[PDB]
Amino acid sequence: DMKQQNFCVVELLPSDPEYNTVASKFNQTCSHFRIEKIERIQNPDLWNSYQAKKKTMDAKNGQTMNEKQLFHGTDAGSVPHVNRNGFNRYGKGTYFAVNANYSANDTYSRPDANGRKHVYYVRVLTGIYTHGNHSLIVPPSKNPQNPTDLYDTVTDNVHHPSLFVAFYDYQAYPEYLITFRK
Amino acid sequence: MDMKQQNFCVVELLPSDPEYNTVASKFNQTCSHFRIEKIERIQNPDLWNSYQAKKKTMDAKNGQTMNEKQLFHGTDAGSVPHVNRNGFNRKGTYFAVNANYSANDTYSRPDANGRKHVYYVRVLTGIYTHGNHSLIVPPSKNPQNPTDLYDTVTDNVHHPSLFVAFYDYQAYPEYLITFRK
Numbered sequence: 001d002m003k004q005q006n007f008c009v010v011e012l013l014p015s016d017p018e019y020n021t022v023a024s025k026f027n028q029t030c031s032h033f034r035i036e037k038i039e040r041i042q043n044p045d046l047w048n049s050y051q052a053k054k055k056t057m058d059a060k061n062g063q064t065m066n067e068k069q070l071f072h073g074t075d076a077g078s079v080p081h082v083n084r085n086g087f088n089r090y091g092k093g094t095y096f097a098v099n100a101n102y103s104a105n106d107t108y109s110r111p112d113a114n115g116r117k118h119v120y121y122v123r124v125l126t127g128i129y130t131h132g133n134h135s136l137i138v139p140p141s142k143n144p145q146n147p148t149d150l151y152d153t154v155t156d157n158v159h160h161p162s163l164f165v166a167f168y169d170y171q172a173y174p175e176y177l178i179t180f181r182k
Numbered sequence: 183m184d185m186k187q188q189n190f191c192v193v194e195l196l197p198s199d200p201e202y203n204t205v206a207s208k209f210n211q212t213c214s215h216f217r218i219e220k221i222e223r224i225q226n227p228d229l230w231n232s233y234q235a236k237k238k239t240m241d242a243k244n245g246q247t248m249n250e251k252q253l254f255h256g257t258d259a260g261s262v263p264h265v266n267r268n269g270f271n272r273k274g275t276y277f278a279v280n281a282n283y284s285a286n287d288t289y290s291r292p293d294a295n296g297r298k299h300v301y302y303v304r305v306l307t308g309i310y311t312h313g314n315h316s317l318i319v320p321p322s323k324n325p326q327n328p329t330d331l332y333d334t335v336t337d338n339v340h341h342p343s344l345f346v347a348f349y350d351y352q353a354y355p356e357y358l359i360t361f362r363k
């Protein structure tokens with residue numbers, strides 16, 4: 001691996017507790033769908049870059065719990081690209097949902113020619129977030145005197161978030177891929 | 183060990199590696215007007231071991247025959263994770279001698295970004311004959327022994343351009359070529 005971000009796809013066995021944990025989070029809002037398989041994406045370069053950003057965010061945001069496990073539905077065609085590059089380049093960032101049902105919508109996890117749908121269960125560095133708007137290439141400024149320090153993500157509702165928008169590279173790790181059908 | 187899950191790794195070949203240049207040179211014999219984005223080696227130990235066991239059996243049965251060929255197979259972007267894990271396993275799978283046949287938008291459909299995908303596949307062609315439409319399996323070799331069948335079917339037995347494989351673990355999708363026009 002010479003920064004190629006090579007990866008391995010590990011299919012989880014249903015007897016593995018990790019499969020049961022991922023299936024339970026998906027099943028909180030998607031229990032009417034049937035899971036065909038859950039795979040773990042093992043991309044060392046992408047993981048190390050994500051972990052370097054998490055450590056920087058942890059040392060900057062004090063008591064804040066910087067990480068959340070969120071859902072991202074995508075088409076079958078984008079899966080090899082997400083496994084290699086993640087989601088790297090309310091805003092022109094990447095959208096993530098708190099609830100799998102939102103991501104299970106056909107507009108996001110479009111059914112392929114065999115009726116299969118794909119949703120990632122992603123580690124996202126949500127950090128410090130605020131309410132956002134349409135035209136954003138980077139999140140808004142925190143302080144007026146210090147505008148270089150910007151928010152980590154933007155959300156639809158700061159008190160009760162249902163979705164998050166990430167704008168930076170290595171802010172999301174596509175840990176699990178859920179393949180399922182209606 | 184996998185627990186026979188057929189887990190795989192995708193290794194992007196560096197242009198500085200001879201492997202990239204060998205695959206690129208074979209593709210370029212008929213597709214030098216296209217431009218390669220990347221070449222990836224698919225490393226699936228379970229799929230490989232099963233393919234190698236089929237190769238050993240075919241080598242023991244077919245005498246002087248060169249049982250293996252490196253052929254091309256165009257596919258849509260969406261089928262790539264399925265091929266990487268399951269190969270072309272279960273009216274068979276079509277393979278082309280020349281990459282330009284598989285580079286047709288009918289087989290290697292351009293995705294939303296204009297990327298096209300063709301695999302460079304190790305295929306156990308073995309002993310082959312001319313084939314027709316409705317085949318779930320290849321024809322019989324002998325009438326008294328109908329259980330012994332051809333390994334593959336082709337468009338032309340003397341100058342093959344196309345092959346059809348029907349059995350499991352008969353093809354190993356070794357390289358994935360991502361390219362555009």
Ligand SMILES: C[C@@H](Cn1cc(CNC(=O)CCCC(=O)Nc2cccc(C(N)=O)c2)nn1)c1ccccc1
Nearest residue numbers: 071072073074095096097102103104107108109163164
């Ligand atoms: C009939 C319309 C309606 N339409 C468009 C959409 C796309 N969604 C939005 O515009 C909502 C704002 C973007 C958003 O919330 N994305 C999002 C949020 C959380 C997770 C995910 C994800 N990928 O899982 C994606 N939904 N419906 C349609 C128009 C064009 C294409 C498809 C559908």
Ligand SMILES: C[C@@H](Cn1cc(CNC(=O)CCCC(=O)Nc2cccc(C(N)=O)c2)nn1)c1ccccc1
Nearest residue numbers: 254255256276277278284289313314315336337344345
């Ligand atoms: C033995 C003959 C006879 N024949 C007719 C048929 C009916 N099916 C078709 O005509 C559809 C096949 C289209 C084709 O040529 N596909 C092809 C060939 C090589 C590679 C690829 C690919 N996906 O890259 C795709 N099957 N066999 C033959 C064998 C191989 C290819 C075409 C013909």
